[PDB]
């Protein structure tokens, strides 16, 4: 019994941070094999992040201009190349701590670990999803630029997420391992916000799952919806439309604890038009959207790595 | 910006996790130097459990009978003790990824990150803390007894919690790394109950200090408050009462916002009264008590 935001085991990923220093800009690197992948804006000043020409502030580095940094090691750079927002350093030595891996690029509602570093040391590791309006509701001070998001599958690492920025409204927002970043934000000190964000359906429902199997069931009833009735209900409150494809993924859970999933939507329904009445679900008084159904799954079955 | 419930990394403790059986009974262990640290109810079968003679069970036990895989490497057994509920196994290779440790026994109140284990390896990583009523709010499954609850500050791990078993009401009970249980609880499938939980109240006034340096400030009223009268009003909402040695712990947090120790405990007193009114604090429509004051610090 229990259900906790939890967090992937860091492990394979601490044995991967590295510190990268351009000029008076430190952050950090994630090494792997003899590569170190880090945000491209390391080579900036603040009067650059204005309006910056990446390619002609990287022509101006040589490789001893970046200094790496793994423990109390110096790598040194044989090389340098820009991929989208993220500079790759050639190293002159492979990491011998470099796990099984791979880049993933990942969904709005999809979750994942971060393991939030500082001069290349892992500081803390904490769980959250990219929201709808591809931003994460991360925790990040200045010098985790470079921290990277995760998930496991098996005994391969998902590297997901790397972080580059904070929004005015205090939220994240950062890049896929190949440069690419979630939503429409640039790597520039220029004036940009948030979209207004929404639920994700699919996971509060998982969670409405994680309660049950957990014995909280006052939010059920003898009710059910039909899909097009509920998605009309969640336009209403801000709730992302939920598809034939997130019922099909909620399957599992609905034939582990009897209740289908347009039954669930009904309760969810319920709950959207007129609140929690004085209780709680999970020791929670708002609805959670930061557990998928995969994630629901794992922790009340516990798959290891 | 942003405030989270984070967890330490938990590579360190990873290094550590073995599989240990005795029997039938498989549960994990924590291998440090040569010596591998599990619970002691590792020996006993579920008809044991109601009263078992550890020590009797014990003595029956050969190096033998106890099988540790560290990863697919079976590790060999060369002694063993028992040192209150945790079994001590002896084991012939010293485990290379010893990291630099200590052992520490926690009070309530205090955080701690928790390695959630089945068959030794590592499921998933997530904070706690531990209740005024000695137990914790885990998630924790069948097999996932002999998972540790630890801090990492500087270098060093500090294995605080060793997970032992689950109380009717779905919450946890363990005990330090010296076997000794956190409450007046017992390694027996006797009828045993938490008591009545309470608010960790200096962990409240914390995450308020946390909320107020992310710049949020619509719960801060004009009123202070005394000690005395503080506690009269928190004791009424099941709060633990507030002692002037957390009035002392919680100055720094004071001094960066501007805020005395006092004028937020009333702040409190008025949360407590009229709710949020719709509104949240560090994205939580419920006050959060599993931040500690020196969580608060490292975060912020
Ligand atoms: O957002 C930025 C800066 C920036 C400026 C313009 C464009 C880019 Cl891509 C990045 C670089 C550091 N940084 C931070 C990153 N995360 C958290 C932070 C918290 C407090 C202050 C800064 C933080
Ligand atoms: O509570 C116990 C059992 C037990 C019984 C009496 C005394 C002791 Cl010390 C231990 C051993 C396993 N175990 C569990 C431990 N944590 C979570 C669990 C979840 C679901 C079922 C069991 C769980
Ligand atoms: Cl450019
Ligand atoms: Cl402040």
Request: proline share 4%; charged share 15%; hydrophobic share 35%.
């Amino acid at each position: 019994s229990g259900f906790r935001k939890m967090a992937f085991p860091s492990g394979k990923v601490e044995g991967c941070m590295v510190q990268v220093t351009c000029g008076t800009t430190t952050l950090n690197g994630l090494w792997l094999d003899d590569v170190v992948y880090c945000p491209r804006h390391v080579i900036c000043t603040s009067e650059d992040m204005l309006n910056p020409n990446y390619e002609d502030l990287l022509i101006r580095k040589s490789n001893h201009n970046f200094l790496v940094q793994a423990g109390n090691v110096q790598l040194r750079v044989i090389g340098h190349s820009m991929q989208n927002c993220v500079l790759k350093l050639k190293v002159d030595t492979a990491n011998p701590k470099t796990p099984k891996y791979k880049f993933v690029r990942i969904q709005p509602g999809q979750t994942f670990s971060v393991l939030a570093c500082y001069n290349g040391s892992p500081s803390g590791v904490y769980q959250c999803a990219m929201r709808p309006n591809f931003t994460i509701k991360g925790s990040f001070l200045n010098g985790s630029c470079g921290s990277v998001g995760f998930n496991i599958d098996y005994d391969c690492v998902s590297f997901c997420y790397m972080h580059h920025m904070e929004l005015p409204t205090g939220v994240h927002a950062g890049t896929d391992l190949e440069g690419n970043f979630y939503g429409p934000f640039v790597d520039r000190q220029t004036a940009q916000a948030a979209g207004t964000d929404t639920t994700i359906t699919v996971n509060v429902l998982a969670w409405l799952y994680a309660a049950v199997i957990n014995g909280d069931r006052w939010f059920l009833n003898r009710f059910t919806t039909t899909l097009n009735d509920f998605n009309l209900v969640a336009m209403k409150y801000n709730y992302e439309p939920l598809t034939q494809d997130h019922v099909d993924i909620l399957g599992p859970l609905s034939a582990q604890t009897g209740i289908a999933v347009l039954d669930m939507c009904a309760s969810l329904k319920e709950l959207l038009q007129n609140g929690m009445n004085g209780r709680t679900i999970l020791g929670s008084a708002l609805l959670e959207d930061e557990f998928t159904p995969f994630d629901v799954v794992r922790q009340c079955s516990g798959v290891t790595f």
